[PDB]
Amino acid sequence: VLSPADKTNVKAAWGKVGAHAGEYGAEALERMFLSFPTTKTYFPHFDLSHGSAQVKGHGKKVADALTNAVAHVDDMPNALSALSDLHAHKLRVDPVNFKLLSHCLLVTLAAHLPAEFTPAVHASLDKFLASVSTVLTSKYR
Amino acid sequence: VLSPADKTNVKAAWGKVGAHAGEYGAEALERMFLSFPTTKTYFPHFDLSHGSAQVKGHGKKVADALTNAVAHVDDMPNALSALSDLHAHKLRVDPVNFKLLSHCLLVTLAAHLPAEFTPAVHASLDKFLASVSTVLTSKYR
Amino acid sequence: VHLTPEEKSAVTALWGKVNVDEVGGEALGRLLVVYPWTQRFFESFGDLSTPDAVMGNPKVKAHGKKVLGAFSDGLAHLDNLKGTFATLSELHCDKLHVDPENFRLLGNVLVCVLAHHFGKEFTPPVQAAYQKVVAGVANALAHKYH
Amino acid sequence: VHLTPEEKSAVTALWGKVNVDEVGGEALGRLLVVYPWTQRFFESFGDLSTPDAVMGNPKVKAHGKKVLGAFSDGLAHLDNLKGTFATLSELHCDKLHVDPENFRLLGNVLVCVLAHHFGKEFTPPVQAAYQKVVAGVANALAHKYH
Numbered sequence: 001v002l003s004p005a006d007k008t009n010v011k012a013a014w015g016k017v018g019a020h021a022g023e024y025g026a027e028a029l030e031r032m033f034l035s036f037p038t039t040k041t042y043f044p045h046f047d048l049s050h051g052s053a054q055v056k057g058h059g060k061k062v063a064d065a066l067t068n069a070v071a072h073v074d075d076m077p078n079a080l081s082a083l084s085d086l087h088a089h090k091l092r093v094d095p096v097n098f099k100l101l102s103h104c105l106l107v108t109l110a111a112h113l114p115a116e117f118t119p120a121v122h123a124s125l126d127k128f129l130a131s132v133s134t135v136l137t138s139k140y141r
Numbered sequence: 142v143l144s145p146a147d148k149t150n151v152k153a154a155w156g157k158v159g160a161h162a163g164e165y166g167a168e169a170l171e172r173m174f175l176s177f178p179t180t181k182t183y184f185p186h187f188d189l190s191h192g193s194a195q196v197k198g199h200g201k202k203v204a205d206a207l208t209n210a211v212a213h214v215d216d217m218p219n220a221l222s223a224l225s226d227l228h229a230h231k232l233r234v235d236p237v238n239f240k241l242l243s244h245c246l247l248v249t250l251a252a253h254l255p256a257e258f259t260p261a262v263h264a265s266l267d268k269f270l271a272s273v274s275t276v277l278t279s280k281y282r
Numbered sequence: 283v284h285l286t287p288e289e290k291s292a293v294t295a296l297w298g299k300v301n302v303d304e305v306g307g308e309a310l311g312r313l314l315v316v317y318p319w320t321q322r323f324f325e326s327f328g329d330l331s332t333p334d335a336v337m338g339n340p341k342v343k344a345h346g347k348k349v350l351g352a353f354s355d356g357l358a359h360l361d362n363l364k365g366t367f368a369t370l371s372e373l374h375c376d377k378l379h380v381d382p383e384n385f386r387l388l389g390n391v392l393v394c395v396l397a398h399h400f401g402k403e404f405t406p407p408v409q410a411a412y413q414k415v416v417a418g419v420a421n422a423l424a425h426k427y428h
Numbered sequence: 429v430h431l432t433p434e435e436k437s438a439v440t441a442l443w444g445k446v447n448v449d450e451v452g453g454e455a456l457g458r459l460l461v462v463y464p465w466t467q468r469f470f471e472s473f474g475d476l477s478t479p480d481a482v483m484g485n486p487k488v489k490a491h492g493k494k495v496l497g498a499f500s501d502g503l504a505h506l507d508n509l510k511g512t513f514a515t516l517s518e519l520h521c522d523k524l525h526v527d528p529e530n531f532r533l534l535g536n537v538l539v540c541v542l543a544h545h546f547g548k549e550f551t552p553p554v555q556a557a558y559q560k561v562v563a564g565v566a567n568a569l570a571h572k573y574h
């Protein structure tokens with residue numbers, strides 16, 4: 001579970017990404033596709049070229065959904081309810097891939113927010129991403 | 142999450158296991174130790190050969206806890222809370238290992254339940270063991 | 283780096299007893315029931331709506347036969363799994379876009395089916411052998427991904 | 429695990445700028461903070477009650493230094509990694525009893541640390557290289573387990 005300290009750290013670190021939502025999401029996705037090529041099997045319908053509008057768009061949708069979750073950190077099952085529906089019944093991305101994206105999001109945040117990325121915040125963000133993944137996969141079966 | 146059919150399936154299957162739960166537990170451990178040797182790292186203090194009484198005793202505690210989890214398939218987190226603390230804060234078994242043992246429990250059940258282990262029951266048991274696993278690690282951090 | 287001489291024998295011996303069509307159909311059927319998201323790859327397969335229907339679906343049976351047939355062939359080359367499945371590995375990446383994690387799920391489902399069908403005979407040491415094998419096949423199938 | 433030549437070149441170039449002691453104690457420190465269960469082997473290290481205490485603990489730093497020291501040293505042999513790490517592998521299995529998953533958690537913490545540290549220079553392609561390295565080292569470290 002996210003502790004209140006966890007919730008404080010996430011809100012602080014993420015409010016900090018702010019307007020770079022789209023930029024950081026796209027970077028995270030690109031880190032993922034490159035480091036973990038198997039993840040591209042979910043995007044054979046994207047131009048996965050560095051800088052592609054498709055990846056930039058998805059990045060923003062991912063960041064915005066994460067912005068939402070932070071904004072409703074106490075009530076994430078409900079706030080992400082339609083998204084978990086989408087992933088459970090249509091996209092059907094194997095659960096293992098969420099840890100890979102979550103990892104690349106951590107790496108992205110570390111590379112952009114050196115001041116904010118303390119060991120304690122690193123830990124809180126890792127738990128947070130994990131909880132989002134859990135919510136997004138809660139309806140799989 | 143565990144549906145009413147899941148709970149019905151688990152109770153049925155585990156009910157059929159009945160008095161062999163203990164035996165099936167040690168078997169599952171034996172299966173794990175041979176199929177996934179990395180798991181032996183948590184038991185440096187055990188004789189791990191076949192027939193081992195240390196393995197048989199532990200298998201019985203595992204099975205008993207699963208029986209008890211079944212008896213509280215409505216309130217699993219509290220029923221297992223002691224085990225959560227223990228695993229979280231002393232045993233500190235890496236989370237990846239719960240999937241290995243769960244898989245070996247599944248295999249053990251399959252090998253002893255020719256009639257009962259239908260696809261639907263298999264699906265439910267796997268869900269059930271995953272939930273137990275989730276509960277047992279829910280306090281790790 | 284994969285599969286001891288003796289474990290090879292347990293594999294060979296148990297597999298001599300296996301009706302590959304039966305097992306393949308059962309294992310693919312169970313993959314799709316137990317891990318329903320794997321259904322995303324078989325949209326054209328017809329009725330997959332419940333456990334019954336999945337297990338009785340003729341296209342699932344057909345394909346399970348094909349898949350496990352390829353698996354069977356590979357058991358004859360346990361020392362060269364990568365080279366054996368390289369063609370299918372690139373097919374699964376370039377043409378089919380199958381997350382290689384699926385091969386690991388199927389491996390574990392097949393292990394369950396072997397256990398369910400063979401009972402006491404699927405002994406812990408025989409399971410151990412088969413775990414190494416399915417891991418090896420999954421690894422070989424994943425190897426040409428890029 | 430089959431790093432291209434430019435990938436190896438990228439690895440070494442970046443590592444040439446790494447303060448091993450500091451990054452060593454940063455990474456093992458963060459491992460113990462981020463995955464508290466990893467503390468199980470270090471109850472003889474003193475205080476681990478807080479992030480600050482764990483990051484501050486000199487025995488942590490010390491071991492961090494010793495481990496990234498061996499990692500650092502292994503980077504010179506990206507050719508055959510499991511060879512160069514064989515003996516340390518045996519040691520971690522038979523005497524130390526370290527679940528090899530621990531190596532994988534440490535690999536991802538190390539990557540996070542290189543990211544935090546080098547920032548912009550830690551490009552995605554430089555990351556992809558380091559992911560292969562840290563996976564390779566973990567596989568090598570696990571390979572002798574039994």
Ligand code: HEM
Nearest residue numbers: 039042043058061062065066091093097098101102132133
């Ligand atoms: C933090 C984890 C994740 C978050 C927050 C997330 C969020 C989202 C959002 C907001 C969308 C778009 C929904 C819409 O169009 O209204 C989406 C779609 C999608 N996601 Fe997820 N997702 C996550 C994990 C993953 C992972 C790990 C994968 C595969 C590796 C994946 C694959 C996809 C795909 C293929 C789509 C459809 C893309 C398209 O056609 O535009 N997602 N996700």
Ligand code: HEM
Nearest residue numbers: 180183184202203206207224232234238239242273274277
């Ligand atoms: C279904 C999953 C599991 C259940 C239900 C379970 C249950 C238990 C129980 C009932 C005990 C005895 C605690 C007591 O003394 O009251 C125990 C202890 C222990 N468990 Fe777990 N456990 C599970 C998974 C695992 C796994 C995957 C590992 C490692 C691979 C593990 C490692 C241990 C160890 C080393 C002990 C104590 C051994 C000793 O007495 O020296 N457990 N567990």
Ligand code: HEM
Nearest residue numbers: 320323324348349350352353370378380384385388419423
């Ligand atoms: C041991 C593991 C596997 C082996 C050896 C294998 C082998 C094969 C073979 C030989 C074919 C060709 C079918 C034909 O000749 O007509 C095939 C097709 C295919 N496989 Fe795999 N397979 C494996 C696992 C999987 C898994 C786990 C999935 C998805 C979860 C998958 C998805 C597919 C799909 C979607 C096709 C094309 C089916 C069609 O024609 O519509 N495979 N596979």
Ligand code: HEM
Nearest residue numbers: 466469494495496498499516519520524526530531534565
């Ligand atoms: C790249 C990763 C790692 C490398 C290269 C590495 C290497 C080493 C080396 C060189 C030693 C000293 C061997 C000796 O004293 O003979 C050692 C010892 C040790 N390692 Fe690892 N190690 C790694 C990861 C880990 C991790 C992640 C853990 C625990 C979470 C761990 C636990 C230990 C312990 C408890 C010792 C003994 C320390 C002592 O006796 O003071 N190692 N390792």
Ligand SMILES: O=C(O)CCOc1ccc(-c2ncc[nH]2)cc1Cl
Nearest residue numbers: 095137138140141142143268271272
């Ligand atoms: O396989 C995974 O990593 C998780 C996703 O799929 C599930 C796996 C298991 C369960 C479950 N059902 C009951 C308790 N835990 C639920 C879901 Cl949605």
